Amino acid sequence: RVKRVWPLVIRTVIAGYNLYRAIKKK
After folding, report:
1. Can you tell me the distance from the alpha carbon of 9 to that of 17, in angstroms, rounded to the nearest whole number?
2. CA-to-CA distance for 9 and 7, rounded, in angstroms?
3. What is the number of alpha carbons within 13 Å of residue 23 lying toward its C-beta?
4. Which protein family is it in?
5. How many whole angstroms separate alpha carbon 4 and alpha carbon 15?
């Protein structure tokens, strides 16, 4: 598998829909 593709791209989707939405959905 890949080790690092998008450094900032993902950080946006993750920091915008994976920082609270994802966490809370543990």
Report:
1. 12
2. 6
3. 7
4. Belongs to the cathelicidin family.
5. 17
- Residue 18, burial from CB neighbour count under 10 angstroms (0-12, 13-18, 19+): middle
For this PDB entry, the determination method is NMR
Residues 6+ positions from 14 with CB-CB distance below 8 Å: 22
State the residue for tokens 């809370």.
Answer: 24
DSSP class of residue 1 equals: -
Single-letter amino acid, residue 5: V
